[PDB]
C-alpha cells in the first residue's frame, strides 16, 4: 500500500511537471511527422546532391 | 526543435533545389579544368612577388 | 536508448560550440548577401571580357 | 476518484484511441525500433567525424 | 497523431540512413577540406593581408 501511494503521487508530480510545458509537448508528434515528411522530401527532390 | 527544422526545411527547399542546381553549373567547368586552377595557384606568388 | 545518449551527447556538443557562430554569419551576410545580389547583372559580362 | 470521474473516462477514452493507432501500426513500430538501433550510431558516426 | 507519426518516423529513418550511407564520407571530406582552407587564408599574416 505505500508502495501504491508513492506511486499515485509520485505519478501526479511527473505528469504535472510534463503538462506545465503542455503548449510544446501537444505538437510533438505532428512537429515529429511534418519534419519526417520535410526530410523525406529534401531528400527525394534532389537526386544530384551527391554529384555537386 | 522537430518545429525548427521543419520550419526551415519548408520554407527554404525550393531554395535550396535552386542552390545545388547553380551550385552543380558553376562547379562542372572548374572540375573539368581543375589542373589550370591548381596551376595558376601555384603561378600566381611568384608573380605577385 | 544507448545509441540516442551517445548521438543525443555528440550533437549537442557539437551545436553548442558552432550554433552561435552560424546565427552570427548568417545575420552580418546579411548586407553583403544583398551587395552581391545588386551587381549580378555586371558579372558574366565582366569575366567574359576579362576571358 | 469520484470527484474526477470525468477525467478517468477521459483518459480511458484516449489511452483506447492511443492504444488502437498503435497496435494498428504494429510493423511500422517494429520497424521503426530496428531503424532506430543503427541510424543514432551512424548519426553519431558522421557527427563525430566533424566534431 | 500516432499512426502518422509512427510511419512517418519510420520513413524519415530509412531516408536518414540511405542518405548518410550515400553522402557521409564525401559531406565530412568536403568540411574537413573547408576547415583546412579557411583555417590557412586565417593565419595572422593572411588575415592582415586581406
Same mark, same amino acid.
Given at each position: 500500500?505505500?508502495?501504491?501511494?508513492?506511486?499515485?503521487?509520485?505519478?501526479?508530480? $511527473? @505528469?504535472?511537471? *510534463?503538462?506545465?510545458?503542455? +503548449?510544446? /509537448?501537444?505538437? $510533438? @508528434?505532428?512537429? *515529429?511527422?511534418?519534419?519526417? +515528411?520535410? /526530410?523525406?522530401?529534401?531528400?527525394?527532390?534532389?537526386?544530384?546532391?551527391?554529384?555537386? | 526543435?522537430?518545429?525548427?527544422?521543419?520550419?526551415?526545411?519548408?520554407?527554404?527547399?525550393?531554395?535550396?533545389?535552386?542552390?545545388?542546381?547553380?551550385?552543380?553549373?558553376?562547379?562542372?567547368?572548374?572540375?573539368?579544368?581543375?589542373?589550370?586552377?591548381?596551376?595558376?595557384?601555384?603561378?600566381?606568388?611568384?608573380?605577385?612577388? | 536508448?544507448?545509441?540516442?545518449?551517445?548521438?543525443?551527447?555528440?550533437?549537442?556538443?557539437?551545436?553548442?560550440?558552432?550554433?552561435?557562430?552560424?546565427?552570427?554569419?548568417?545575420?552580418?551576410?546579411?548586407?553583403?548577401?544583398?551587395?552581391?545580389?545588386?551587381?549580378?547583372?555586371?558579372?558574366?559580362?565582366?569575366?567574359?571580357?576579362?576571358? | 476518484?469520484?470527484?474526477?470521474?470525468?477525467?478517468?473516462?477521459?483518459?480511458?477514452?484516449?489511452?483506447?484511441?492511443?492504444?488502437?493507432?498503435?497496435?494498428?501500426?504494429?510493423?511500422?513500430?517494429?520497424?521503426?525500433?530496428?531503424?532506430?538501433?543503427?541510424?543514432?550510431?551512424?548519426?553519431?558516426?558522421?557527427?563525430?567525424?566533424?566534431? | 497523431?500516432?499512426?502518422?507519426?509512427?510511419?512517418?518516423?519510420?520513413?524519415?529513418?530509412?531516408?536518414?540512413?540511405?542518405?548518410?550511407?550515400?553522402?557521409?564520407?564525401?559531406?565530412?571530406?568536403?568540411?574537413?577540406?573547408?576547415?583546412?582552407?579557411?583555417?590557412?587564408?586565417?593565419?595572422?599574416?593572411?588575415?592582415?593581408?586581406?
Amino acid at each position: 500500500s505505500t508502495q501504491v501511494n508513492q506511486l499515485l503521487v509520485n505519478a501526479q508530480t $511527473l @505528469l504535472a511537471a *510534463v503538462n506545465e510545458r503542455g +503548449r510544446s /509537448v501537444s505538437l $510533438l @508528434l505532428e512537429r *515529429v511527422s511534418s519534419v519526417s +515528411r520535410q /526530410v523525406e522530401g529534401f531528400v527525394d527532390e534532389n537526386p544530384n546532391l551527391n554529384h555537386v | 526543435a522537430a518545429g525548427s527544422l521543419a520550419d526551415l526545411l519548408s520554407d527554404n527547399r525550393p531554395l535550396l533545389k535552386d542552390t545545388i542546381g547553380y551550385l552543380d553549373v558553376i562547379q562542372a567547368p572548374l572540375v573539368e579544368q581543375k589542373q589550370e586552377v591548381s596551376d595558376i595557384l601555384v603561378q600566381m606568388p611568384q608573380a605577385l612577388k | 536508448l544507448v545509441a540516442a545518449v551517445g548521438f543525443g551527447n555528440t550533437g549537442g556538443d557539437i551545436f553548442e560550440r558552432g550554433g552561435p557562430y552560424l546565427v552570427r554569419g548568417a545575420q552580418d551576410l546579411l548586407p553583403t548577401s544583398a551587395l552581391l545580389d545588386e551587381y549580378s547583372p555586371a558579372l558574366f559580362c565582366t569575366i567574359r571580357n576579362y576571358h | 476518484q469520484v470527484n474526477s470521474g470525468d477525467a478517468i473516462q477521459r483518459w480511458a477514452a484516449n489511452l483506447n484511441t492511443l492504444a488502437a493507432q498503435s497496435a494498428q501500426n504494429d510493423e511500422a513500430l517494429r520497424s521503426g525500433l530496428q531503424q532506430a538501433a543503427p541510424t543514432a550510431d551512424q548519426l553519431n558516426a558522421v557527427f563525430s567525424d566533424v566534431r | 497523431e500516432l499512426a502518422n507519426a509512427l510511419q512517418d518516423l519510420n520513413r524519415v529513418l530509412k531516408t536518414t540512413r540511405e542518405f548518410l550511407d550515400r553522402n557521409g564520407g564525401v559531406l565530412t571530406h568536403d568540411i574537413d577540406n573547408l576547415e583546412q582552407v579557411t583555417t590557412a587564408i586565417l593565419q595572422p599574416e593572411p588575415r592582415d593581408g586581406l
